[PDB]
Swiss-Prot record:
This is High mobility group protein B2. Its main location: nucleus. Residues 20-30, 50-63 have a biased composition (Basic and acidic residues). The chain holds residues 89 to 165 of 210 of the full protein. Keywords: Acetylation, Chemotaxis, Chromosome, Cytoplasm, Disulfide bond, DNA recombination, DNA-binding, Immunity, Inflammatory response, Innate immunity, Nucleus, Oxidation, Phosphoprotein, Repeat, Secreted, Transcription, Transcription regulation. Interacts with POU2F2, POU2F1 and POU3F1. Component of the RAG complex composed of core components RAG1 and RAG2, and associated component HMGB1 or HMGB2. Component of the SET complex, composed of at least ANP32A, APEX1, HMGB2, NME1, SET and TREX1. Directly interacts with SET. Interacts with LEF1.
């Protein structure tokens, strides 16, 4: 709503990565499956993922959320 094309992307969350990559897969075996049922299943696998699909996902959103607090400010009206 109050974001621009030059502004930085919102702060991604670890569960948002894992789900963001497994979102188009749950819609293939479930046509019409909204983002609630697949979000309930994914969260079950996300909390079950080991370092293969969980370590590089939290270190990409955790280090991007804290940097957004200074990025958004500097881009707000420095």
């Amino acid at each position: 709503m109050k974001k621009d094309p030059n502004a930085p992307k919102r702060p991604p969350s670890a569960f948002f990565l894992f789900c963001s990559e497994h979102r188009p897969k749950i819609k293939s075996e479930h046509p019409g499956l909204s983002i609630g049922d697949t979000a309930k299943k994914l969260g079950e696998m996300w909390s079950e993922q080991s370092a293969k699909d969980k370590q590089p996902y939290e270190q990409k959103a955790a280090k991007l959320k804290e940097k957004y607090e200074k990025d958004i400010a500097a881009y707000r009206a420095k």
